[PDB]
Scaffold this active site. Structure first.
Site, PDB file in Angstrom:
ATOM      1  N   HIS A 199      46.602  44.008 -24.649  1.00 43.44           N
ATOM      2  CA  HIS A 199      45.634  44.806 -23.909  1.00 43.44           C
ATOM      3  C   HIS A 199      44.513  43.922 -23.381  1.00 43.44           C
ATOM      4  O   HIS A 199      43.638  43.494 -24.133  1.00 43.44           O
ATOM      5  CB  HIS A 199      45.063  45.921 -24.785  1.00 43.44           C
ATOM      6  CG  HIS A 199      44.338  46.983 -24.017  1.00 43.44           C
ATOM      7  ND1 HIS A 199      44.095  46.891 -22.663  1.00 43.44           N
ATOM      8  CD2 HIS A 199      43.805  48.162 -24.415  1.00 43.44           C
ATOM      9  CE1 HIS A 199      43.441  47.967 -22.261  1.00 43.44           C
ATOM     10  NE2 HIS A 199      43.252  48.754 -23.304  1.00 43.44           N
TER      11      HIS A 199
ATOM     12  N   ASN B  84      40.747  47.554 -18.908  1.00 43.84           N
ATOM     13  CA  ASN B  84      39.915  48.694 -19.185  1.00 43.84           C
ATOM     14  C   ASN B  84      38.604  48.403 -19.874  1.00 43.84           C
ATOM     15  O   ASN B  84      38.071  49.237 -20.548  1.00 43.84           O
ATOM     16  CB  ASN B  84      40.710  49.745 -19.922  1.00 43.84           C
ATOM     17  CG  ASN B  84      41.887  50.249 -19.135  1.00 43.84           C
ATOM     18  OD1 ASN B  84      42.813  50.767 -19.700  1.00 43.84           O
ATOM     19  ND2 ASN B  84      41.826  50.136 -17.849  1.00 43.84           N
TER      20      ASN B  84
ATOM     21  N   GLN C 130      50.685  48.087 -28.471  1.00 44.83           N
ATOM     22  CA  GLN C 130      49.572  47.517 -27.723  1.00 44.83           C
ATOM     23  C   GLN C 130      48.530  46.950 -28.676  1.00 44.83           C
ATOM     24  O   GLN C 130      47.955  47.675 -29.487  1.00 44.83           O
ATOM     25  CB  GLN C 130      48.928  48.557 -26.805  1.00 44.83           C
ATOM     26  CG  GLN C 130      47.871  47.963 -25.887  1.00 44.83           C
ATOM     27  CD  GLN C 130      47.109  49.008 -25.103  1.00 44.83           C
ATOM     28  OE1 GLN C 130      46.616  49.986 -25.665  1.00 44.83           O
ATOM     29  NE2 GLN C 130      47.002  48.804 -23.794  1.00 44.83           N
TER      30      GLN C 130
ATOM     31  N   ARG D 254      48.681  43.759 -20.043  1.00 43.00           N
ATOM     32  CA  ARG D 254      48.125  44.836 -19.231  1.00 43.00           C
ATOM     33  C   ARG D 254      46.837  44.401 -18.537  1.00 43.00           C
ATOM     34  O   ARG D 254      45.968  43.777 -19.148  1.00 43.00           O
ATOM     35  CB  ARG D 254      47.868  46.084 -20.083  1.00 43.00           C
ATOM     36  CG  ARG D 254      47.608  47.346 -19.265  1.00 43.00           C
ATOM     37  CD  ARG D 254      47.734  48.607 -20.112  1.00 43.00           C
ATOM     38  NE  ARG D 254      48.252  49.735 -19.337  1.00 43.00           N
ATOM     39  CZ  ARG D 254      47.605  50.880 -19.145  1.00 43.00           C
ATOM     40  NH1 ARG D 254      46.404  51.068 -19.672  1.00 43.00           N
ATOM     41  NH2 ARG D 254      48.165  51.842 -18.423  1.00 43.00           N
TER      42      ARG D 254
ATOM     43  N   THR E 146      45.631  56.581 -26.553  1.00 45.58           N
ATOM     44  CA  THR E 146      44.818  56.795 -27.744  1.00 45.58           C
ATOM     45  C   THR E 146      44.657  58.284 -28.022  1.00 45.58           C
ATOM     46  O   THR E 146      44.231  59.042 -27.150  1.00 45.58           O
ATOM     47  CB  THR E 146      43.424  56.153 -27.599  1.00 45.58           C
ATOM     48  OG1 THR E 146      43.554  54.727 -27.557  1.00 45.58           O
ATOM     49  CG2 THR E 146      42.532  56.541 -28.766  1.00 45.58           C
TER      50      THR E 146
ATOM     51  N   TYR F 139      37.715  46.117 -22.219  1.00 42.95           N
ATOM     52  CA  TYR F 139      37.667  45.673 -23.605  1.00 42.95           C
ATOM     53  C   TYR F 139      37.573  44.151 -23.666  1.00 42.95           C
ATOM     54  O   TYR F 139      37.548  43.498 -22.625  1.00 42.95           O
ATOM     55  CB  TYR F 139      38.876  46.210 -24.364  1.00 42.95           C
ATOM     56  CG  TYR F 139      38.904  47.723 -24.375  1.00 42.95           C
ATOM     57  CD1 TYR F 139      38.134  48.445 -25.281  1.00 42.95           C
ATOM     58  CD2 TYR F 139      39.677  48.429 -23.461  1.00 42.95           C
ATOM     59  CE1 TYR F 139      38.147  49.828 -25.285  1.00 42.95           C
ATOM     60  CE2 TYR F 139      39.697  49.811 -23.459  1.00 42.95           C
ATOM     61  CZ  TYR F 139      38.931  50.506 -24.373  1.00 42.95           C
ATOM     62  OH  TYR F 139      38.947  51.882 -24.372  1.00 42.95           O
TER      63      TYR F 139
ATOM     64  N   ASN G 205      34.408  51.146 -18.776  1.00 41.37           N
ATOM     65  CA  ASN G 205      33.660  50.326 -19.727  1.00 41.37           C
ATOM     66  C   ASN G 205      32.854  49.230 -19.030  1.00 41.37           C
ATOM     67  O   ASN G 205      32.786  48.096 -19.506  1.00 41.37           O
ATOM     68  CB  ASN G 205      34.600  49.718 -20.774  1.00 41.37           C
ATOM     69  CG  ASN G 205      35.135  50.754 -21.749  1.00 41.37           C
ATOM     70  OD1 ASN G 205      34.443  51.711 -22.096  1.00 41.37           O
ATOM     71  ND2 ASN G 205      36.370  50.564 -22.199  1.00 41.37           N
TER      72      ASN G 205
HETATM   73  C1  LIG Z   1      43.646  60.324 -23.518  1.00 39.86           C
HETATM   74  C2  LIG Z   1      43.990  58.974 -22.962  1.00 39.86           C
HETATM   75  C3  LIG Z   1      44.075  57.874 -23.810  1.00 39.86           C
HETATM   76  C4  LIG Z   1      44.395  56.621 -23.297  1.00 39.86           C
HETATM   77  N1  LIG Z   1      44.479  55.536 -24.137  1.00 39.86           N
HETATM   78  C5  LIG Z   1      44.799  54.290 -23.640  1.00 39.86           C
HETATM   79  C6  LIG Z   1      44.884  53.195 -24.494  1.00 39.86           C
HETATM   80  O1  LIG Z   1      44.679  53.334 -25.697  1.00 39.86           O
HETATM   81  N2  LIG Z   1      45.201  51.954 -23.984  1.00 39.86           N
HETATM   82  C7  LIG Z   1      45.434  51.798 -22.633  1.00 39.86           C
HETATM   83  O2  LIG Z   1      45.716  50.688 -22.185  1.00 39.86           O
HETATM   84  N3  LIG Z   1      45.352  52.884 -21.783  1.00 39.86           N
HETATM   85  C8  LIG Z   1      45.032  54.131 -22.278  1.00 39.86           C
HETATM   86  N4  LIG Z   1      44.951  55.216 -21.431  1.00 39.86           N
HETATM   87  C9  LIG Z   1      45.212  55.035 -19.969  1.00 39.86           C
HETATM   88  C10 LIG Z   1      46.696  55.283 -19.707  1.00 39.86           C
HETATM   89  O3  LIG Z   1      47.446  54.162 -20.122  1.00 39.86           O
HETATM   90  C11 LIG Z   1      46.952  55.558 -18.229  1.00 39.86           C
HETATM   91  O4  LIG Z   1      46.572  54.434 -17.472  1.00 39.86           O
HETATM   92  C12 LIG Z   1      46.163  56.782 -17.782  1.00 39.86           C
HETATM   93  O5  LIG Z   1      46.627  57.919 -18.480  1.00 39.86           O
HETATM   94  C13 LIG Z   1      46.290  57.042 -16.287  1.00 39.86           C
HETATM   95  O6  LIG Z   1      47.618  57.408 -15.983  1.00 39.86           O
HETATM   96  P1  LIG Z   1      47.956  58.936 -15.586  1.00 39.86           P
HETATM   97  O7  LIG Z   1      47.383  59.240 -14.221  1.00 39.86           O
HETATM   98  O8  LIG Z   1      49.453  59.146 -15.595  1.00 39.86           O
HETATM   99  O9  LIG Z   1      47.301  59.854 -16.592  1.00 39.86           O
HETATM  100  C14 LIG Z   1      44.633  56.463 -21.937  1.00 39.86           C
HETATM  101  C15 LIG Z   1      44.546  57.566 -21.088  1.00 39.86           C
HETATM  102  C16 LIG Z   1      44.227  58.819 -21.600  1.00 39.86           C
HETATM  103  C17 LIG Z   1      44.137  59.998 -20.681  1.00 39.86           C
HETATM  104  O1  LIG Z   2      42.458  51.156 -22.911  1.00 47.33           O
HETATM  105  C1  LIG Z   2      42.009  52.053 -22.213  1.00 47.33           C
HETATM  106  C2  LIG Z   2      41.643  53.378 -22.838  1.00 47.33           C
HETATM  107  C3  LIG Z   2      41.306  54.452 -22.033  1.00 47.33           C
HETATM  108  C4  LIG Z   2      40.972  55.669 -22.613  1.00 47.33           C
HETATM  109  C5  LIG Z   2      40.979  55.801 -23.995  1.00 47.33           C
HETATM  110  O2  LIG Z   2      40.643  57.028 -24.584  1.00 47.33           O
HETATM  111  C6  LIG Z   2      41.319  54.724 -24.795  1.00 47.33           C
HETATM  112  C7  LIG Z   2      41.650  53.508 -24.215  1.00 47.33           C
END
Ligand SMILES: Cc1cc2nc3c(=O)[nH]c(=O)nc-3n(C[C@H](O)[C@H](O)[C@H](O)COP(=O)(O)O)c2cc1C
Ligand SMILES: O=Cc1ccc(O)cc1
EC number: 1.6.99.1
Length: 383
Positions: free
Chosen positions: A283, A286, A206, A335, A129, A288, A343
């Protein structure tokens, strides 16, 4: 203590794992020895559009900026340099105190088929996101979004999972997050998907539904419910306060409203496919809506959608079965985050949390053995 390894003893298909893997290549080297394990890199794919190359040849990585994660700007979004670019501007420093490691010899760069897509490597871009969708309308950014995804479709045969996309306004709550229900949204997504495909890469959408993580005031402004699994347990102090202040209290979903969400899942799924997406990811993690049904802390229902492990997994599986019937099992992913507390989820503190997700993996395998295997299972690593 707590591992996601239990999933492998149940689910016999492709497994995507994400969580702190970029700065630990020694862990990745061990995990990819499993022939059906893929790795997702979140924060560093943001800072490195050419991350796939840097992993293959063991190149240093660019630092990421947390302040520009959810900021409405091209800065910290499309202005991250490739390694070849970063050299021309100096260096002058990258990530501090980190020893890189070449992974081009491992299974991370052996081809594998996910759904209909022939991946050339197993470094996956997880959903991220960025909060740069236009308001009103939840419309993908007309200025930078196409270029953003293009930079990260750099390496051919790269699997990309998009940022969380709202299947409907009722599923929303964030003004700057992209939706996937309207025409003007699909016009923009079509451009994004084309840019990805022109780089010989693949894109998975997603499907996102907020639940109690949504902003109650935003929903009240649009005449929308602030819903979840139950109505007597809340995410935190702020959310309960904002719900009463906007006079939009947390609503326990009725069976009909659950069916309405499923219908919106289906329409959103077909919209993505029609727009030219390779597939969709459900999704269910996390914290939701779907996770809120899975987790016993958030789910205090006494009907068919709560009170037991089988009941708490009904919503997620019904969404799965609906999308499988709608667009095919080869275009559907799922996922999960078993150990996550994000959350306000239970996490490992709930002694029965592994059994809850073990059941889901089992039900996925029973469908798989019956001839309808999902493309993959996406797992969020413990932390
Ligand atoms: C800024 C940001 C936005 C994310 N948005 C989502 C999301 O929209 N949906 C989701 O399932 N995970 C989201 N994640 C979690 C990532 O899918 C991933 O699990 C997370 O970055 C941890 O992996 P990493 O250690 O490589 O950063 C987001 C993570 C970050 C940092
Ligand atoms: O779906 C998990 C998630 C985590 C961090 C975000 O900013 C957005 C979504």
């Amino acid at each position: 203590g707590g591992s996601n390894d239990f999933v492998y003893s149940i689910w016999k298909g492709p497994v995507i794992r994400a969580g702190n893997f970029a700065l630990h290549p020694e862990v990745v080297r061990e995990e990819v020895k499993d022939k059906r394990t893929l790795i997702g890199y979140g924060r560093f794919f943001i800072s490195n559009p050419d991350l796939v190359d840097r992993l293959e040849k063991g190149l240093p990585l660019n630092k990421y900026d947390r302040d520009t994660f959810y900021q409405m700007s091209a800065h910290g979004y499309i202005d991250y340099p490739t390694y070849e670019e970063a050299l021309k501007l100096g260096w002058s420093s990258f990530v501090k105190d980190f020893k890189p490691q070449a992974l081009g010899d491992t299974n991370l760069f052996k081809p594998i088929k996910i759904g209909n897509n022939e991946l050339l490597h197993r470094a996956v871009i997880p959903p991220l996101t960025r909060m740069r969708a236009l308001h009103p309308g939840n419309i993908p950014n007309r200025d930078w979004a196409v270029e953003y995804y293009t930079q990260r479709a750099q390496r051919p045969g790269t699997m990309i999972i998009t940022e969380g996309a709202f299947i409907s306004p009722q599923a929303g709550g964030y003004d700057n997050a992209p939706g996937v229900w309207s025409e003007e949204q699909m016009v923009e997504w079509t451009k994004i998907f084309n840019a990805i495909h022109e780089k010989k890469s693949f894109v998975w959408v997603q499907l996102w539904v907020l639940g109690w993580a949504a902003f109650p005031d935003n929903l009240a402004r649009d005449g929308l419910r602030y819903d979840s699994a139950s109505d007597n347990v809340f995410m935190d102090a702020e959310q309960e306060a904002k719900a009463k202040k906007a006079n939009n209290p947390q609503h326990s979903l009725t069976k009909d409203e659950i069916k309405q969400y499923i219908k919106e899942y289906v329409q959103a799924a077909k919209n993505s496919i029609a727009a030219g997406a390779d597939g969709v990811e459900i999704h269910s993690a996390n914290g939701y809506l779907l996770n809120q049904f899975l987790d016993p802390h958030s789910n205090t229902r006494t009907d068919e959608y709560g009170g037991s492990i089988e009941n708490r997994a009904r919503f997620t599986l019904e969404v799965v079965d609906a999308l499988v019937e709608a667009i095919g099992h080869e275009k559907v992913g799922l996922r999960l985050s078993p150990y996550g507390v994000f959350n306000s989820m239970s996490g490992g503190a709930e002694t029965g949390i592994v059994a809850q997700y073990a059941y889901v993996a089992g039900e996925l395998e029973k469908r798989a053995k019956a001839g309808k295997r999902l493309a993959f299972v996406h797992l969020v690593e413990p932390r």
